[PDB]
């Protein structure tokens, strides 16, 4: 799965509404409406594509066929998850085989980790010794996508965000404009999302 780093920019989260009617748009820890009124330090964005029914598995505190070995959200995650249908864009009439899914591995993974090893899964009692065969399976498999399939198997594009919440010099937030500075009077103030009243 691919990830991207975003910093030193002015955001505008309303434009996301320009898209088609979504299938999943949820957030944990922050109400999505007022996202424009908070400033952030660094932004990490992950993207990938999942089968239609298994989009539910992108959720904290649950297990599944992907959460076991591929993508593991920490139990204290705060951020937003977006998922929208892609049958219109990622299907060939002849059937497309260019998407890989993990099937077997010894044990689960800690959150925010990756593994692309090609070691053979020793399912059987015999020592495979690096030889493919019976009870020595190839770790990866391929999905299928046809335009006439049902919505239950149509492809879905999913993106995950992540936040940091003002624990450092912030770099990214909305287009709110500044003003001149006044002191020695009783004034209401707002510094980087920290609001207060008093005298400076």
């Amino acid at each position: 799965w691919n990830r991207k780093r975003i910093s030193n920019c002015v955001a505008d989260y309303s434009v996301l509404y320009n898209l088609a009617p979504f299938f999943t748009f949820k957030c944990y820890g922050v109400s999505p409406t007022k996202l424009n009124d908070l400033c952030f330090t660094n932004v990490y964005a992950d993207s990938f594509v999942i089968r239609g029914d298994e989009v539910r598995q992108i959720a904290p505190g649950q297990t599944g066929n992907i959460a076991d070995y591929n993508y593991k959200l920490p139990d204290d995650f705060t951020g937003c998850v977006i998922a929208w249908n892609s049958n219109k864009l990622d299907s060939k009439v002849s059937g497309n085989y260019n998407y890989l899914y993990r099937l077997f591995r010894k044990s689960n993974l800690k959150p925010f980790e990756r593994d692309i090893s090609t070691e053979i899964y020793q399912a059987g009692n015999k020592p495979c010794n690096g030889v493919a065969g019976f009870n020595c399976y190839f770790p990866l498999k391929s999905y299928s996508f046809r335009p006439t399939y049902g919505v239950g198997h149509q492809p879905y594009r999913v993106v995950v965000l992540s936040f940091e919440l003002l624990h450092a010099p912030a770099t990214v937030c909305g287009p709110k404009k500044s003003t001149n500075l006044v002191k020695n009077k009783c004034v209401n103030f707002n510094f980087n999302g920290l609001k207060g009243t008093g005298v400076l």
Partner: antibody, heavy 119, light 109 residues
Framework: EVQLVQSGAEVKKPGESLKISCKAS????????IGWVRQMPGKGLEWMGI????????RYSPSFQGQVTISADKSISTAYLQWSSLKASDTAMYYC????????????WGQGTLVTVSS | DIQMTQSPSSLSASVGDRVTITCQAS??????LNWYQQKPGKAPKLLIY???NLETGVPSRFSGSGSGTDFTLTISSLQPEDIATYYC??????????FGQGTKVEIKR
């Protein structure tokens, strides 16, 4: 067996309107994409826009947003390229092509259509 | 914005020779390239639709490779039936598309 058919050439004068059409058959028409390309003599090629007639959706280039219109009919399996107003610097050849997003474009192309406008 | 460059603008050679051509970019674009051939006439044709993958229905005198921003195409054995135009183009945005500049070939006799 896939074929493309176009409307004929055309000459007109500034201040008017015009429409062009492109038609194909030999496959399930609703499951592919159509695109337009402009080419004016002495220069290179330059993309204009695409469409997915199966479910009406349009996209446009940064250099031609809000200038030309694209649509299609799935009943007769045809795509329409339509204008609103004409000016003096739009003389060039136009191409309609059929493409597929995942793997390849331009596996086939039309025979090419011409336009001329002057006073 | 994304901008291409081709090199050289033109060249000429004779039969039974190796020929090469280069296409360059201002930033890495992760092997989403393709090449188009268009002989003087009507229809541009697709020749190579990936970094090193060729469309079916074309003999095996063509090759090419590249990554990052360095990309080369070549023909091992020139044949007299090859007089046309060539271009390289790219794609990473859903719609931000552009072709290159142009390469000219001429034969020796």
């Amino acid at each position: 067996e896939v074929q493309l058919v176009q409307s004929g050439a055309e000459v007109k004068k500034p201040g008017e309107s015009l429409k062009i059409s492109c038609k194909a058959s030999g496959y399930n028409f609703a499951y592919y994409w159509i695109g337009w390309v402009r080419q004016m003599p002495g220069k290179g090629l330059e993309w204009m826009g695409i469409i997915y007639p199966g479910d009406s959706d349009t996209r446009y280039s940064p250099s031609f947003q809000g200038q030309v219109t694209i649509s299609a009919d799935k009943s007769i399996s045809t795509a329409y390229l339509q204008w609103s107003s004409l000016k003096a610097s739009d003389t060039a050849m136009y191409y309609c092509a059929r493409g597929e997003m995942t793997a390849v474009f331009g596996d086939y192309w039309g025979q090419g259509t011409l336009v001329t406008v002057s006073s | 914005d994304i901008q291409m460059t081709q090199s050289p603008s033109s060249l000429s050679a004779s039969v039974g020779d190796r020929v090469t051509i280069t296409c360059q970019a201002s930033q890495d674009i992760s092997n989403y390239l393709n090449w188009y051939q268009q002989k003087p006439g009507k229809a541009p044709k697709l020749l190579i639709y990936d970094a090193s993958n060729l469309e079916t229905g074309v003999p095996s005198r063509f090759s090419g490779s590249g990554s990052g921003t360095d990309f080369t195409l070549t023909i091992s054995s020139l044949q007299p039936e090859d007089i046309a135009t060539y271009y390289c183009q790219q794609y990473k945005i859903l719609l931000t598309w552009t072709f290159g500049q142009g390469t000219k070939v001429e034969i020796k006799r």
